[PDB]
From a paper:
Specifically, [name] and a [name] interface 3 mutant, [name]-[name]/L200K1, were assembled using equivalent helical parameters and lattices and were termed Vipp1L1 and Vipp1F197K/[name]_L1, respectively. Vipp1F197K/[name]_L1 was resolved to 3.7 Å overall using helical parameters of a rise of 2.44 Å and a rotation of –75.83°, which were almost identical to those of Vipp1L1. Overall, Vipp1F197K/[name]_L1 and Vipp1L1 subunits were in similar conformations and assembled using equivalent helical lattices. However, owing to the Vipp1F197K/[name] mutation, interface 3 formation was inhibited, with no supporting map and build for helix α5N. The key difference between the Vipp1F197K/[name]_L1 and Vipp1L1 maps was the presence of lipid bilayer in the central lumen of Vipp1F197K/[name]_L1. Here, the inner leaflet formed a tube with a diameter of 4 nm, close to the limit at which hemifusion is expected to occur. Concurrently, the outer leaflet filled the space between the helix α0 stacks. Analysis of the Vipp1F197K/[name]_L1 electrostatic surface potential showed that amphipathic helix α0 was positively charged, with basic residues positioned to attract negatively charged lipid headgroups. In Vipp1F197K/[name]_L1, the ESCRT-III-like protofilaments were rotated ~43° to the membrane tube axis while maintaining similar lateral interactions and ultrastructure by undergoing filament twisting. Overall, Vipp1F197K/[name]_L1 showed how [name] [name] helical filaments have the capacity to tubulate membrane, as reported in other [name] systems.
Numbering used by the authors:
A (entry chain A): 1 to 190, 203 to 213
B (entry chain A), D (entry chain A): 156 to 190, 203 to 207
C (entry chain A): 1 to 52
Write the structure that this text describes.
């Protein structure tokens, strides 16, 4: 395709492989967990604001409800002291409060549902982060398994992955050669008969 | 989730996980390469 | 994802593990307690103003 | 509280607590690894 695209792909493919060699599992696992938790903390605060707004809405609902009964009581006080004028006017105004109570409760319900969903999501996130925090230890166990098995293979005769075995086998061969030298020097410079007793018994 | 890379933290976590699994697989293969009826 | 993000994540993951090795339980427990108490002291004064 | 990290002091305190619990668990595992009816 293009040319500049190709050059930049090569440069990128080199830098990325340079970086991916520096990453070390034991530390980057912890770094990932740390940032995971940081993000969870920053989400808690959003949930908290949601809850506070719900409290405010319910308080407004309660106050409107209280004023409804207040103006009913004012109507009754008019009936006791005043006349039909004030008694009817109290309820005339109470119309608005009765309207607003329902107009507000409708939205208060949805607000409550939203807060419930948010709380559920927060709990789910906490659980998943805990799962990851266990997986980290499982991965460390896997690292140890890998190194132990690599230790075992280094113990075999024909491979030289381990320096200790290298030295051990080298000395073994040196000594076997020395003994062979002695035996050859023995040869160089220089049971039928006793099997007869087996016939005696 | 395992199969999506929207979050950088998960990207790094999964990358290290795969690196370590590959290392263990290398060890196991090296084990194989160089080399219950009775107790039932 | 990005590249600078990745480099800085590596550098951070190295510095943090460098620090977490220096922390020693017997002393950092006491340091945490000391700062705990300092904060409590600074809250007492707010309560006092409320009362006044 | 145990599970939230809003305060740095608690962060450090819990971190050291977990470090020490892990150290004790290491000791116990090492104990296991290398190795009341009668008095009732």
């Amino acid at each position: 395709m293009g040319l500049f695209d190709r050059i930049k792909r090569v440069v990128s493919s080199n830098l990325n492989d340079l970086v991916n060699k520096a990453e070390d599992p034991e530390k980057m696992l912890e770094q990932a967990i740390l940032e995971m938790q940081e993000d969870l903390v920053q989400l808690r605060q959003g949930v908290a604001q949601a809850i506070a707004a719900q409290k405010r809405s319910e308080k407004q609902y309660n106050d409107a409800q209280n004023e409804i009964n207040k103006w009913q009581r004012n109507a009754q006080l008019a009936l006791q002291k005043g006349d039909e004028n004030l008694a009817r006017q109290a309820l005339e105004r109470k119309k608005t409060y009765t309207d607003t109570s329902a107009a507000l409760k409708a939205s208060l319900d949805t607000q409550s549902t939203q807060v419930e969903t948010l709380k559920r999501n927060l709990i789910q996130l906490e659980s998943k982060i805990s799962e990851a925090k266990t997986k980290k230890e499982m991965l460390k166990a896997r690292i140890t398994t890998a190194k132990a098995q690599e230790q075992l293979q280094g113990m075999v005769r024909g491979m030289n992955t381990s320096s200790a075995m290298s030295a051990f086998e080298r000395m073994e061969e040196k000594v076997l050669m020395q003994e062979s030298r002695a035996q050859a020097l023995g040869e160089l410079a220089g049971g039928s008969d006793v099997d007869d007793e087996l016939a005696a018994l």
